[PDB]
Ligand binder design. Sequence first.
Ligand SMILES: *[C@@H]1O[C@H](CO)[C@@H](O)[C@H](O)[C@H]1NC(C)=O
Ligand SMILES: *[C@@H]1O[C@H](CO)[C@@H](O)[C@H](O)[C@H]1NC(C)=O
Ligand SMILES: *[C@@H]1O[C@H](CO)[C@@H](O)[C@H](O)[C@H]1NC(C)=O
Lengths: 50, 67
Amino acid sequence: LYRLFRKSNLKPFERDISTEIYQAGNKPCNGVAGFNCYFPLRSYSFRPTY
Amino acid sequence: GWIFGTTLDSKTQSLLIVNNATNVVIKVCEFQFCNDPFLDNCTFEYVSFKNLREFVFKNIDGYFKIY
Ligand SMILES: *[C@@H]1O[C@H](CO)[C@@H](O)[C@H](O)[C@H]1NC(C)=O
Ligand SMILES: *[C@@H]1O[C@H](CO)[C@@H](O)[C@H](O)[C@H]1NC(C)=O
Ligand SMILES: *[C@@H]1O[C@H](CO)[C@@H](O)[C@H](O)[C@H]1NC(C)=O
């Protein structure tokens, strides 16, 4: 699984582990998916025929 | 001992150094400890008015240095 949303750029060799649903801006989410409320955890679905 | 981190409420990573008079316990587990913080997930773990002890703790490049 891979990331696409985060609120900051990480320092080198840093290990903040957080898999919560992230805001896309200043709109609050409170753990509810929707507009401006996106999951960062995506997948590539690795097949040998790609 | 000393306890480090950002939030320290069993949410994200939190350092812990405890001297229990025999060893020096160093853990990075996020889990809670004794409810009153006194002496009677673990990706890194390390076990080893007359007195003045001086320490310097710094954190550079993901490295925690103790003098
Ligand atoms: C470290 O944690 C603090 C929490 O107070 C946060 O504001 C800061 O952005 C974090 N640094 C990172 C993610 O590099
Ligand atoms: C101190 O902590 C170490 C690490 O868990 C343990 O092996 C040792 O028995 C402890 N000593 C005392 C006196 O509690
Ligand atoms: C300890 O590890 C488990 C397994 O990933 C995790 O579900 C749990 O939240 C961790 N405990 C923390 C972060 O306090």
